[PDB]
Amino acid sequence: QCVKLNDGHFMPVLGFGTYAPPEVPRSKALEVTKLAIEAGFRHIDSAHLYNNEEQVGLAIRSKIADGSVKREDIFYTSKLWSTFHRPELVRPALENSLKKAQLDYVDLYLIHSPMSLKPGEELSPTDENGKVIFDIVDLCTTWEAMEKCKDAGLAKSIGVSNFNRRQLEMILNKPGLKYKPVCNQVECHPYFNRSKLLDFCKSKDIVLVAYSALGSQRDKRWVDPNSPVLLEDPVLCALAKKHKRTPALIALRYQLQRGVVVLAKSYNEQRIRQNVQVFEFQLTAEDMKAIDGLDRNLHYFNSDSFASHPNYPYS
């Protein structure tokens, strides 16, 4: 199942999340991406940040070589990291990602975040207090460099991630805009359902792609351990019982029925296969209203590291 993007390309509506934190051996990304493709995932979400593009690209190429899929059947995303927002760094960052994955093109290239970081060797250049050292880049200039990557054929489609409405607006209002973003990949789940941003995106034919749709991996670098655990929510668990599915499947299905493309990360073979069951059942209107009731403005990523960045998207 795919949605048509505003530049005519197609995005599968369920995607596999590939991030795992640095304690997880790098080889695991190769194994679990092949599992995801075997289970029926066709959209695969990676990034420079993830330090896994080589393993994820090998898993794709393995499944092409063994005859399981064709390249045109796979929708592969990577993302421009925030130390590469200066326009002359954008096509190089993309070419690096293509070389790591050994692919000729990515289906989608995103600006990973609006929170530009000091250019240099470090992924996360940190000040005195562990705040990211910010850079000031007009992201409209970064966008123009993204458009040139599409014109060169390095990315089939281009989009953004972690933009708020006003930051998206800034791009859509750019003089001489050539390509709208096709999507805005953002934190989105029943505790932070982004209904206003969703309505804006739909008005502009921009796909909202939900990450941390299962509640995030609750990494201690970014996530308060006190934050309620999404999949323990009693309304999600009651709906799981009513449908004889699981709280994760309820959270994924919720998004599809709102018109949201949804990612799901799992490094567990059973849960990878379980997550494709999202296409096998439906939530009723009352189930969806119950889930809408859970909204509490909770973005799990909530650290000082970035909450003080001048382009921090949350307010």
Ligand SMILES: NC(=O)c1ccc[n+]([C@@H]2O[C@H](COP(=O)([O-])OP(=O)(O)OC[C@H]3O[C@@H](n4cnc5c(N)ncnc54)[C@H](OP(=O)(O)O)[C@@H]3O)[C@@H](O)[C@H]2O)c1
């Ligand atoms: N653009 C950005 O800034 C950004 C930010 C965050 C994430 N992302 C992308 O979005 C992807 C997904 O988000 P996420 O990594 O935060 O994780 P997530 O999809 O919200 O999943 C959270 C946790 O759910 C568990 N899980 C998966 N399926 C389950 C099931 N059926 N039942 C119970 N638990 C289940 C997984 O644990 P197991 O592995 O143990 O199954 C996983 O660690 C990322 O991997 C990345 O691709 C992008």
Ligand SMILES: O=[N+]([O-])c1ccc(S(=O)(=O)c2ccccc2)cc1O
């Ligand atoms: O789990 N991931 O996939 C992932 C983890 C961390 C970040 S981040 O840029 O630190 C960030 C920081 C703050 C808010 C949003 C994003 C990007 C990611 O994509």
